[PDB]
């Protein structure tokens, strides 16, 4: 809205990373203090610094807050293993008559080397045919990272309806697994000759096909 933030910033583990926040002349440039918060994906945000002059208890001295007139800046020294969150600008807005937050910046560069995927295709069982639906699942497992595109074909034309893709989660051995469903009906399930899932990972494409008859 009134506060704009960059989408992402790049940095190195050991150099200074500085973020710039720009607002208007009635909320941040008017004279109000600013407050910075960290939005960890899974835990409630806490206070990092208030007023850019005092250090709250339990917060390291590594964070520095300054206000260069209309714009406020935050500087850090070194990237540890907990900066995988979002930074927001919070200041009192007189026009909104309340508190307004910023956009949010993501702090990550790269942590995902390559691996070899493997897929499996399982046709629906006999009890699923009487439910007036056809759920086609092609599971993908033992792959890294979790960025796999899913395409469905029926050996004559691609299927662009009912295609879904689930987000992958970390396995026990630091890998990823995912599944892809396809909503259909048993009326046209037997008419088609075969069904298959097609995926592509870093140029490696594998295909598995099942036969209902």
């Amino acid at each position: 809205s009134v506060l704009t933030q960059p989408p992402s910033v790049s940095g190195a583990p050991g150099q200074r990373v500085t973020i710039s926040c720009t607002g208007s002349s009635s909320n941040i440039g008017a004279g109000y203090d600013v407050h910075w918060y960290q939005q960890l994906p899974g835990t409630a945000p806490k206070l990092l610094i208030y007023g850019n002059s005092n250090r709250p208890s339990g917060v390291p001295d590594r964070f520095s807050g300054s206000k260069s007139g209309t714009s406020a800046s935050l500087a850090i020294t070194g990237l540890q293993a907990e900066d995988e969150a979002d930074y927001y600008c919070q200041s009192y807005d007189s026009s909104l008559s309340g508190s307004v937050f910023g956009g949010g910046t993501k702090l990550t560069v790269l942590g995902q080397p390559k691996a070899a995927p493997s897929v499996t295709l399982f046709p629906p069982s006999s009890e699923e045919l009487q439910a007036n639906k056809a759920t086609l699942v092609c599971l993908i497992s033992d792959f890294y990272p979790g960025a796999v595109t899913v395409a469905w074909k029926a050996d004559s034309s691609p299927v662009k309806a009912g295609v879904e893709t689930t987000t992958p989660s970390k396995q026990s051995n630091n890998k990823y697994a995912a599944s892809s469903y396809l909503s259909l009906t048993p009326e046209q399930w037997k008419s088609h000759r075969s069904y298959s899932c097609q995926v592509t990972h870093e140029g490696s494409t594998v295909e598995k096909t099942v036969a209902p008859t």
């Binding site: 009635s26 008017a30 004279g31 109000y32 009192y92 007189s94 026009s95 008559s97």
Partner: protein
């Protein structure tokens, strides 16, 4: 001290202006500031709008 008949030019006539107009526009532009007063609600005295 003796002037004969004829035409004679003595000085020049200059019409000096008495008023000056220096206005460049007819009106200037404005910025949104009536919302400070024309608002649905105001603030308090411990925390007022700045």
């Amino acid at each position: 001290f003796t002037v004969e008949k004829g035409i004679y030019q003595t000085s020049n006539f200059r019409v000096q202006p008495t008023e000056s107009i220096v206005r460049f526009p007819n009106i200037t532009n404005l910025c949104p500031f009536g919302e400070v007063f024309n608002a649905t609600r105001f603030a308090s005295v411990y925390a007022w709008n700045r």
